[PDB]
Write an enzyme that holds these catalytic residues in place. Structure first.
Site, short mmCIF file in Angstrom:
data_model
loop_
_atom_site.label_atom_id
_atom_site.label_comp_id
_atom_site.label_asym_id
_atom_site.label_seq_id
_atom_site.Cartn_x
_atom_site.Cartn_y
_atom_site.Cartn_z
N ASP B 377 0.58 -1.10 -0.06
CA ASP B 377 -0.16 0.13 0.02
C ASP B 377 1.00 1.46 -0.15
O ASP B 377 2.13 1.20 0.30
CB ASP B 377 -0.86 0.01 1.19
CG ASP B 377 -1.90 1.26 1.11
OD1 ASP B 377 -2.50 1.54 0.13
OD2 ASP B 377 -2.04 1.63 2.34
N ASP B 530 -1.95 -0.65 5.79
CA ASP B 530 -2.12 -0.02 7.12
C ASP B 530 -3.74 -0.11 7.47
O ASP B 530 -4.46 0.17 8.30
CB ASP B 530 -1.79 1.37 7.23
CG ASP B 530 -1.96 2.29 6.35
OD1 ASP B 530 -2.15 2.03 5.09
OD2 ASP B 530 -2.54 3.25 6.69
N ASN B 533 -8.87 -1.04 3.70
CA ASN B 533 -8.85 -1.26 2.17
C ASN B 533 -7.74 -2.40 1.78
O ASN B 533 -7.95 -2.99 0.66
CB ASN B 533 -8.44 0.26 1.68
CG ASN B 533 -7.64 0.17 0.08
OD1 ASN B 533 -6.82 0.17 0.03
ND2 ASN B 533 -8.79 -0.34 -0.80
F1 ALF Z 1 -2.31 4.10 -0.20
AL1 ALF Z 1 -3.54 3.08 0.26
F2 ALF Z 1 -4.70 1.96 0.02
F3 ALF Z 1 -3.39 2.92 -1.46
F4 ALF Z 1 -3.46 2.94 2.10
#
Ligand code: ALF
Ligand SMILES: CCCCCCCCCCCCCCCCCC(=O)OC[C@H](COP(=O)(O)OC[C@H](N)C(=O)O)OC(=O)CCCCCCCCCCCCCCCCC
Ligand SMILES: *[C@@H]1O[C@H](CO)[C@@H](O[C@@H]2O[C@H](CO)[C@@H](O[C@H]3O[C@H](CO)[C@@H](O)[C@H](O)[C@@H]3O)[C@H](O)[C@H]2NC(C)=O)[C@H](O)[C@H]1NC(C)=O
Ligand SMILES: *[C@@H]1O[C@H](CO)[C@@H](O)[C@H](O)[C@H]1NC(C)=O
Lengths: 320, 805
Positions: B377, B530, B533
């Site tokens: 992420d 984190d 998502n």
């Molecule tokens: F940066 Al993200 F989902 F994409 F925490």
């Protein structure tokens, strides 16, 4: 916050040895320099043992003991002439050997009752069911129950030195042939005042016995459940070809002078129903035991495929 | 397709989310069936029952108790995990929601909402379902929304109410102004909603994603909104992007299964050969019942075909130790006690959050040392500006041989700058963009993929893919077989230095991980994030890593390991994972080797009895071979051994490549251990067989027996297997010295203690003085010393040869 101890942080002091080919190279010499003198010594020691085997099964029809394969009178006697080329000097040990006899069979090995042979009163009249092809006879417990007891070797062997041609007997002592610990602790007589016959009261002899366990020998210290001949047989062997100590020919002129000899046997034990043979072994001992070249040949060859590896690798590493 | 009435007034499931797997009543039947469907567990139960019923050398308590232990331990672990998921299900459910039933503001639980009722979400309050915005009480009909649980970004998205209903506040949206919302069936894609509203007085406005308020989105900077529940739980876009947790197995765990199957075939071959040779041997009339051991009438009357099966079963139990049930117990203890090294580590401690590393599962410790792919992420994981050592950690991971892909729900313009700032995209890196600007819908993506694979990359390249384009590639990959979209795109991904996936959805992120997991060969995939998502891709990968940051603990609770920082992944993989894999891979090999060495001499012994199933060793030796004699030294090795120092492991990341691909559990290493065990077991038996070819081994002429033979074999075996581990040890702590030398000293002391007293509780005294009489002969000492050296010579020669050139 997390406790900073050596164990919890995986930093305990450690030895951390290094073992490469500059510190492990020089043990292929240190080992080859000890194993070769040891193998040579224990190989010379074995060669110095005097030994002789006499097979008295009598299967071939040109044997003195062929008459006892299937006799009419069951206590037959035969004598085998044998010659001692060189004299036996030290203490001499007499063995009897049996081949194709599976004393290590699973069914055979457990056919005993160790508490019964330990002199336990509750087990004398109540033998275990593991010794039960031979547990009770004639509605009565068998005093030495089990197959190992029932099959006890029962030939009598006598040695005569010829000379003249006048046989002179050789003194054989039956005491001191079994383990001290299993004669004095593991094998005990049942409790009773002074007479051994009345200690075995509600018990019966083994079916192949011709005399009860309290008549095995006249000496009261070698009479029943502590007969050393019984105890030696009770120690089941590892392989189907084995030897068992019979007598001791004590050192006295050699113990067994070189010359003609006689082996009078009371051929009682049937081994020819299966493909078995009977032997008589006369041997001397050393610090290493009987005659066996395996240990010497193995130490010599292991200390010789170590020194050569060391030589061929030190040279190979000297190329740098 | 789906028809929804606004107030459920004339002009589907409830939102009860289920993340758990077991019900209270059906947990035991469902867990014991999944546990005993495994080949190892089924085999252990079969063996336990055979020892109970047919035959057993030792007690059937040393066979059924460890099985009970491992079954209860696994059952408790899985039941506790399911209870933890149940607890979160009941806090997402049973949450206060205000529903306007009849001109009044009724208060319900979140799970009692039905499709087609007006909810009354307030400011800074999460939406309970997929609402269609009917009215914001402002005069503008616009609200502000932060979808941090769907894309991980904390900006303020703006949504628009239905124009003809923007005026309906004051619980007066039930003003007999009812409507019929005709929407599509639920789909997992967050940015595509089609439908219409038919307001009756009929005006028909076309609805879109600008009116749909998704579950898991917080309403921001607006006091109150009214919306209709269009999709409820398990059909909401948040629940359709959830997927679910599958049973995670490490590479060591799957190699243990192959090792167990090989040894199961070995055990069956041993038993079959022994039974066939037994009944060939018994064909001679005097081989069975030669008048000195005769059978009972019961044994003679036992049916022929039944006795063959019983003898096969008895040989099975006699040779059954080559599949160690103690190995599983030791593995559970080691796995449970090794997680504490991650928990206690002071390098994972954060002063800002006052927390360290968190271990959620102890069964994936070795998988940290086998990682091949890292999926990251971006917001909160890689960035705060950049995080502390985001670029250094990526450089270290690349030096370790890993591929780092960024899967983010953020837009490409900002996601790409972060990849350029993390040195993931270099200045001389040419980007192959498959986003929505380069793609012009239609079949231009076909041309793009062929132009990038067949003529551009198959001869520096970083791929950039959009969520919409990945949707086309994936959903349209089941139409053609001549040239697969998925295969062509995956080749380009594998030939690129880095891959950026932007504007993704929570399920699209797990779909990418599934693609890499299903390549030729099995790459071990790691996911780190984190937020919620990133929960789906964490639950999909081989090892999922959560981060304790500012977006909650949804990712830290659904993960296997949780670290405060992304830089914390360098040590978690390079040192901890490396050590964890090397310890357990050695434990498994040693456990199989030491038990094959234990049983091969006993198998060779049946050729010298009448294949009578007579054990070579005493029952007290068979029982405590794996409990007391050879149990502690390997457990200490698997908990304390550092073949390479931890400081060195972190310093040099190229040492991570030496154990990649399950290198220590491959065919070569397995064959080495298996043939070494066979050679040593043959030496054990035959060196003492040739030793026993004499009248006497003692100076007093007394002879030994079948128990002394086995005791000599057992002594040689125990010393050889202990000294092999001692030779393999590189990190000698005081605990290692204690266990390794105390096992050897305790063997000699138990031998002198157990034998030496006539035990009143025993029905046999077969081992009364066997050990003490065996040690009274110098020849036996020399033979034991020679056999231990012959058994370790192939090992010493190896450490001599492979340490030079
Ligand atoms: F940066 Al993200 F989902 F994409 F925490
Ligand atoms: C959420 C929960 C987290 C997980 C918990 C982790 C923490 C562990 C807690 C403690 C649990 C204790 C384990 C209980 C299991 C009992 C097992 C037991 O004793 O049965 C015996 C088992 C298996 O025997 P085997 O040799 O493979 O042979 C079996 C074969 N079927 C046969 O026929 O036979 O043998 C074994 O499975 C024994 C191996 C275990 C080794 C460790 C114990 C060693 C004992 C101490 C050493 C003895 C002392 C002597 C050494 C002293 C010198 C240093
Ligand atoms: C020396 O040991 C021999 C083997 O144990 C033993 O032979 C066995 O002798 C017993 C007793 O006579 C026999 O048992 C049965 O013999 C007849 C059948 O021949 C039966 O009618 C009897 O009732 C008795 O139950 C065994 O059959 C026999 N076994 C063999 C293989 O021959 C010798 O008797 C022993 N000699 C001694 C102790 O002097
Ligand atoms: C021993 O056997 C021989 C046969 O050569 C015989 O002459 C002699 O009398 C036997 N001695 C005894 C004591 O049986």
């Amino acid at each position: 916050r997390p406790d900073n101890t050596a164990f919890k942080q995986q930093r305990l002091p450690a030895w951390q040895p290094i073992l490469t080919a500059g510190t492990v190279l020089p043990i292929f010499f240190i080992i080859g320099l000890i194993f070769i003198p040891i193998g040579i010594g224990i190989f010379v020691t074995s060669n110095n043992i005097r030994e002789i085997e006499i097979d008295y099964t009598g299967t071939e029809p040109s044997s003195p003991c062929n008459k006892c394969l299937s006799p009419d009178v069951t206590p037959c006697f035969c004598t085998i002439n044998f010659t001692l080329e060189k004299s036996f000097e030290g203490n001499v040990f007499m063995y009897y050997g049996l081949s194709n006899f599976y004393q290590n069979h699973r069914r055979y090995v457990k056919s005993r009752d160790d508490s019964q042979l330990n002199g336990d009163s509750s087990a004398l009249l109540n033998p275990s069911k593991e010794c039960e092809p031979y547990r009770r006879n004639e509605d009565k417990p068998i005093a030495p129950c089990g197959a190992i007891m029932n099959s006890m070797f029962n030939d009598t062997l006598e040695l005569f030195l010829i000379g003249d041609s006048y046989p002179i007997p050789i003194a054989l002592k039956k005491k001191g042939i079994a383990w001290w610990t299993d004669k004095n602790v593991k094998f005990r007589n049942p409790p009773g005042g002074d007479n051994l016959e009345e200690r075995f009261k509600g018990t019966t002899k083994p079916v192949n016995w011709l005399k009860p366990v309290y008549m095995l020998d006249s000496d009261p210290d070698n009479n029943g459940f502590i007969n050393e001949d019984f105890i030696v047989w009770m120690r089941t062997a590892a392989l189907p070809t084995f030897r068992k100590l019979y007598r001791l020919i004590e050192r006295k002129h050699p113990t067994l002078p070189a010359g003609r000899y006689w082996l009078n046997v009371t051929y009682n034990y049937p081994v020819h129903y299966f493909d078995g043979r009977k032997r008589m072994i006369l041997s001397t001992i050393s610090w290493m035991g009987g005659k066996n070249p395996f240990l010497g040949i193995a130490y010599i060859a292991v200390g010789s495929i170590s020194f050569l590896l060391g030589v061929v690798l030190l040279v190979i590493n000297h190329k740098y | 397709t789906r028809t929804v009435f606004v107030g459920n007034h004339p002009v589907f499931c409830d939102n009860r989310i289920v993340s758990s797997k077991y019900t209270l009543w059906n947990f035991l039947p469902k867990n014991l069936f999944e546990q005993f469907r495994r080949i190892a567990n089924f085999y252990f139960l079969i063996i336990f029952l055979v020892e109970v019923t047919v035959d057993t050398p030792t007690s059937p308590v040393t066979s059924g108790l460890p099985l009970f232990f491992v079954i209860t331990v696994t059952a408790i672990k899985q039941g506790y995990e399911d209870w933890l998921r149940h607890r979160a299900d009941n806090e997402v459910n049973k949450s206060t929601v205000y529903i306007i039933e009849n001109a009044k503001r009724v208060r319900k639980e979140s799970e009692k909402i039905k499709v087609g009722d007006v909810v009354e979400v307030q400011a800074d309050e999460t939406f309970p379902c997929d609402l269609i915005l009917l009215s914001s009480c402002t005069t503008d009909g616009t609200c502000y929304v932060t979808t941090a649980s769907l894309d991980g970004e904390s900006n303020c998205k703006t949504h628009y109410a239905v124009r003809d209903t923007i005026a309906l506040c004051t619980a007066e949206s039930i003003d007999t102004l009812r409507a019929a919302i005709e929407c599509e069936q639920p789909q997992p894609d967050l940015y595509k909603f089609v439908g219409r509203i038919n307001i009756y007085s009929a005006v028909a406005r076309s609805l879109g994603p600008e009116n749909l308020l998704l579950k898991g989105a917080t309403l921001k900077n607006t006091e109150k909104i009214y919306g209709v529940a269009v999709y409820t739980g398990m059909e909401t876009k948040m629940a359709l992007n959830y997927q679910g947790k599958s049973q995670k197995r490490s590479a060591v765990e799957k190699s243990i299964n192959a090792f167990l199957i090989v040894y199961l075939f070995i055990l069956l071959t041993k038993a079959a050969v022994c039974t066939t040779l037994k009944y060939v041997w018994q064909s001679t009339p005097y081989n069975d019942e030669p008048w000195y051991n005769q059978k009972t009438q019961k044994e003679r009357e036992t049916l022929k075909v039944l006795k063959m099966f019983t003898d096969f079963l008895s040989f099975m139990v006699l040779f059954n130790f080559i599949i160690p049930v103690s190995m599983y117990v030791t593995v559970e203890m080691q796995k449970f006690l090794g997680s504490f090294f991650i928990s206690w580590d002071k390098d994972f401690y954060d002063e800002e959050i006052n927390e360290g590393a968190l271990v959620n599962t102890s069964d994936l410790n070795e998988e940290l040392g086998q990682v091949d792919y890292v999926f990251t992420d971006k917001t909160g994981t890689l960035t705060e500006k950049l995080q502390d050592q985001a670029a250094e950690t990526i450089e270290a991971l690349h030096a370790a041989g890993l591929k780092v892909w960024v899967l983010t729900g953020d837009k490409m313009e900002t996601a790409k700058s972060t990849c350029y700032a993390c040195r993931l995209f270099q200045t001389n890196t040419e980007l192959l963009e498959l986003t929505t600007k380069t793609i012009e819908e239609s079949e231009r993506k076909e041309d793009r993929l062929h132009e990038l694979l067949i003529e551009y990359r198959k001869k520096e390249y970083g791929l950039i893919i959009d969520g919409s384009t990945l949707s086309l590639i994936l959903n349209s990959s089941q139409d053609s077989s001549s040239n697969n979209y998925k295969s062509i795109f995956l080749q380009i991904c594998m030939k690129c230095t880095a891959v950026l996936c932007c504007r993704m959805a929570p399920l699209q992120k797990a779909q990418i991980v599934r693609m890499v997991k299903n390549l030729k060969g099995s790459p071990i995939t790691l996911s780190i994030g984190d937020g919620a998502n990133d929960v789906s891709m964490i639950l999909e990968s081989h090892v999922g890593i959560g981060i304790k940051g500012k977006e909650g603990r949804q990712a830290a609770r659904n993960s296997d390991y949780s670290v405060p920082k992304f830089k914390h992944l360098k040590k978690l993989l390079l040192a901890h994972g490396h050590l964890y894999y090397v310890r357990i891979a050695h434990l498994v090999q040693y456990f199989f080797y030491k038990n094959l060495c234990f049983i091969l001499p006993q198998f060779l012994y049946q050729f010298f009895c009448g294949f009578s199933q007579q054990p070579l060793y005493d029952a007290a030796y068979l029982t405590m071979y794996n409990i007391c004699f050879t149990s502690l030294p390997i457990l200490a090795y698997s908990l304390l051994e550092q073949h390479i120092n931890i400081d060195t492991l972190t310093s040099d990341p190229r040492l991570y490549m030496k154990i990649s691909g399950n290198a220590m559990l491959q065919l070569g290493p397995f064959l080495y251990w298996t043939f070494l065990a066979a050679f040593e077991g043959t030496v054990f038996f035959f060196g003492t067989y040739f030793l026993f070819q004499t009248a006497s081994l003692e100076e007093n002429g007394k002879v030994y027996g079948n128990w002394t033979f086995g005791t000599i074999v057992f002594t040689v075996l125990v010393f050889t297997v202990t000294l092999k581990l001692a030779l393999d040890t590189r990190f000698w702590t005081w605990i290692n010295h204690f266990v390794i030398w105390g096992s050897l000293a305790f063997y000699v002391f138990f031998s002198f203690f157990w034998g030496g007293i006539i035990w009143p509780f025993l029905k046999q005294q077969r081992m009364y003085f066997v050990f003490a009489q065996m040690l009274s002969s110098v020849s036996t000492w020399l033979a034991i010393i020679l056999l231990i050296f012959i058994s370790l010579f192939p090992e010493i020669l190896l450490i001599v040869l492979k340490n030079v050139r």
